[PDB]
Symmetry: C2
């Protein structure tokens, strides 16, 4: 379980903003994260990497879910947020997330 | 396996190409690219270097060069190629670099 422990330590790290070279502003919510983790699950983040990134405010409601998924592998889906998460996952080029939303069975 | 396995393998792949790596480890001449975030999870020695100032490149003494890659492979994979011929130069480096999990194995065998 070495990799499980490392990722939850990374997750704990970003909650505290530690070692986080990436700060994301969506709506009015600011999020700390690691570019390296973001690049693992998102083609959009891979592409805009080259300080401070602003994302569409219409994602604020579900951005935390999307990010938790990156650090934990669990996308907090619901019949009520499914279409929102899907739209955000497509735009942010998060392959695994689109698959999860499309296959989602309430 | 699982989600964490896949993410760490990607970060491993990343550093093996110097992508999204914010750390440069210069050990006696051979450099290793890595992620501070991951370095911090396994050793407080790296936590201190990161905070207690060190500009950019981290310069360690050439003594580890030999085994360093192994110790670093362990960070990104959870497995240290503990050979009967390195078991000692690996353990000494683990205690030196302050990597608790690494020493434990060196001892186990």
């Amino acid at each position: 379980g070495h990799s499980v422990r490392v990722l939850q330590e990374l997750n704990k790290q970003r909650e505290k903003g530690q070692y986080c070279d990436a700060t994301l502003d969506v709506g009015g919510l600011v999020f700390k994260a690691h570019w390296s983790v973001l690049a693992c699950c998102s083609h959009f983040f891979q592409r805009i990497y080259g300080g401070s990134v602003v994302l569409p405010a219409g994602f604020a409601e579900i951005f935390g879910l999307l990010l938790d998924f990156f650090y934990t592998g669990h996308l907090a889906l619901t019949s009520g947020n499914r279409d929102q998460v899907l739209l955000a996952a497509k735009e942010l080029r998060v392959p695994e997330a689109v698959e999860l939303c499309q296959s989602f069975q309430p």
